[PDB]
Amino acid sequence: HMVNGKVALVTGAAQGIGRAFAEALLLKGAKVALVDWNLEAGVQCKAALDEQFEPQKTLFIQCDVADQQQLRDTFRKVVDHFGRLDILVNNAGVNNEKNWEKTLQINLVSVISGTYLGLDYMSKQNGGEGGIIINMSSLAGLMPVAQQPVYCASKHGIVGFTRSAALAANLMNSGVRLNAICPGFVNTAILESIEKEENMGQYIEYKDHIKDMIKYYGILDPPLIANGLITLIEDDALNGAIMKITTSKGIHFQDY
Amino acid sequence: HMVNGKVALVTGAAQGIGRAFAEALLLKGAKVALVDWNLEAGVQCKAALDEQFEPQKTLFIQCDVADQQQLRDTFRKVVDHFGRLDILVNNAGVNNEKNWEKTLQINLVSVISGTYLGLDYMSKQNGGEGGIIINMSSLAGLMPVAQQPVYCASKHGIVGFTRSAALAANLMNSGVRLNAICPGFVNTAILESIEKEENMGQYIEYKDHIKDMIKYYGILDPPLIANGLITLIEDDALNGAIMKITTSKGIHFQDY
Ligand SMILES: NC(=O)C1=CN([C@@H]2O[C@H](COP(=O)(O)OP(=O)(O)OC[C@H]3O[C@@H](n4cnc5c(N)ncnc54)[C@H](O)[C@@H]3O)[C@@H](O)[C@H]2O)C=CC1
Ligand SMILES: NC(=O)C1=CN([C@@H]2O[C@H](COP(=O)(O)OP(=O)(O)OC[C@H]3O[C@@H](n4cnc5c(N)ncnc54)[C@H](O)[C@@H]3O)[C@@H](O)[C@H]2O)C=CC1
Ligand SMILES: CCCC[S@@H](O)c1sc2nc(-c3nccs3)cc(-c3cnc(C)n3C)c2c1N
Ligand SMILES: CCCC[S@@H](O)c1sc2nc(-c3nccs3)cc(-c3cnc(C)n3C)c2c1N
């Protein structure tokens, strides 16, 4: 289908949701490039995947997504190695309200820069044969959170940018589809950032609320988030859609 | 009431909506500091206002909101001159998709930096007697726009940050209220930015759509937007609310 024999570039694939994405894509029969700033974690992940699939179907590149030149050298290294780019996934993110400027830079700016860098290669006008770009958001992009003000700001921006760029691409005859995912609580190391003042700052005194709400709702395993990505990729007529994943309902879509 | 004898700091007050805000506040009996990066326009505005009100109620400081140190030096210059800060309005903004990074920096980052600088002075925990912070957004912060992708991203983030910070302030016992305004098309020079590829880039070929939309939706006078800010200020029990101004309906509130 639209997965076999296709090249995918995934950001933040050393651990967690990105690693699950890469595993699913490799299982479906694709060639994957893994981008992360943590070298040891990425190398260990590649070694782990090399025990299941063939080594060539995988590549690892170290890069900080905030630095634009690194991303541009990363996109060019991938294309010169495989031959074409067909799937892009922008998933890297952090949580830090003390250093709220770096969080905004990583979460929001890098997504837009990657989206643009990807349209520069995948577009019909520039010689491409189309493809699909997916940007990762959170339920914090649709509801407010008292203890994560700057983090909420970034997810909302991601949602708006994705929705606008979908229509823009439809107008330009680019052959590219754009969609976003909005998951709930996921069992990853990021949750541990809640319990440390270095990441929370003046909001640490109110972490018990988030702890209680996690106890209420529950946590979702990283593999279930990946199936949603695969579902997005194989559907041809999905552009500008927002996916919500919840433990109570499942995979559903926001309505406007 | 809560307007007389109070100090207000307004950003982007040289021309347009900010100037209307300043005029309304001065008419109601307040002392106003005008912040803009255009020196000539600000000086001319201050001279124009000096012909109506007393000079001692008007202060003009020329600062770029993006540079944090300038913003910190402006806030301290304002307090050391008057004596206290009671109202803050973050209204400065631009529209440029070609240089989409500077637009994001000006529209979103500066708003958060100013809100935080303002809470550092207005909060009871730090010796203050409270006050009100207002951040300017657009209807593009609630609906997508094909030709203004990065601009749409900046307004959504503003809305999310304001909604979260309102609850955060309610929890901390700060005595500060936070709300935002989401106007429609307003008769200002910013509209002229649509007709220039310098400000639009690859999206210039699709400006005719906005042109028809501007004509159909009509236009709103800046003093009418100023009547909304005053309404927000005099209402004590409004925190975390979003105002929408339209030519068909009027002044109304988003519901969640
Ligand atoms: N886990 C959760 O509860 C939720 C997470 N998300 C989002 O999911 C995405 C993935 O995060 P998780 O896997 O949950 O967390 P994680 O912390 O386990 O993984 C994030 C990955 O991003 C990488 N990364 C961070 N900044 C980077 C940078 N500047 N350059 C390159 N790589 C960078 C890290 O090395 C790490 O491998 C993030 O955007 C996060 O905000 C959204 C919904 C909820
Ligand atoms: N006019 C409209 O149709 C709408 C405008 N808005 C928003 O209203 C706000 C006010 O803009 P308008 O009065 O309409 O436009 P305008 O272009 O007439 O005025 C903007 C003002 O901001 C100042 N400014 C811009 N960047 C600055 C910076 N970095 N530092 C200091 N001053 C800076 C400019 O000198 C100017 O005086 C903006 O945030 C805009 O996005 C929202 C709804 C629609
Ligand atoms: C850095 C920490 C990463 C986790 S956040 O993006 C995140 S995910 C999430 N999911 C939910 C769910 N609601 C219903 C089913 S699941 C809720 C929250 C959340 C936490 N605090 C609030 C006010 N909210 C809305 C959050 C929340 N704050
Ligand atoms: C830099 C130009 C500044 C004007 S933008 O923030 C702005 S204000 C506005 N207002 C409206 C109104 N809708 C109903 C009554 S008024 C519509 C738009 C707009 C323009 N293009 C679209 C798709 N939209 C939604 C816009 C729009 N794009």
Numbering used by the authors:
A (entry chain A), B (entry chain B): 1 to 256
Paper text:
The enzyme 15-prostaglandin dehydrogenase (15-PGDH) is a key negative regulator of tissue stem cell activity in proliferation and in the repair of tissue injury, whose negative regulation of tissue regeneration is conserved across multiple organs. 15-PGDH acts via its NAD+-dependent enzymatic activity of oxidizing and degrading prostaglandin E2 (PGE2), and related eicosanoids, which provide key trophic support for stem cells in multiple tissues. 15-PGDH assembled as a homodimer, which is the proposed physiological form of the enzyme.
Despite the relatively small size of the monomeric protein (29 kDa), image and post-processing yielded a cryo-EM map for the 15-PGDH-SW209415-NADH complex at a nominal resolution of 2.4 Å. Following asymmetric refinement, the cryo-EM structure exhibits strong density for (+)-SW209415 in a well-defined binding pocket in each of the 15-PGDH protomers. Cumulatively, the interaction of the sulfoxide of the inhibitor with S138 and Y151 of 15-PGDH contributes significant binding energies and so serves to coordinate (+)-SW209415 interactions with 15-PGDH. The thienopyridine moiety of (+)-SW209415 is sandwiched between F185 and L139, where π-stacking with F185 provides the largest contribution of all 15-PGDH residues in binding energy. The thienopyridine reaches into the catalytic pocket where an amine group at position 3 forms a hydrogen bond with Q148 of 15-PGDH. Additionally, the (+)-SW209415 thiazole contributes to binding through π-stacking interactions with Y217 and hydrophobic interactions with L139 of 15-PGDH. Together these results show that binding of (+)-SW209415 stabilizes the lid structure of the α10-α12 triple-helix to create a stable configuration of (+)-SW209415 complexed with 15-PGDH.
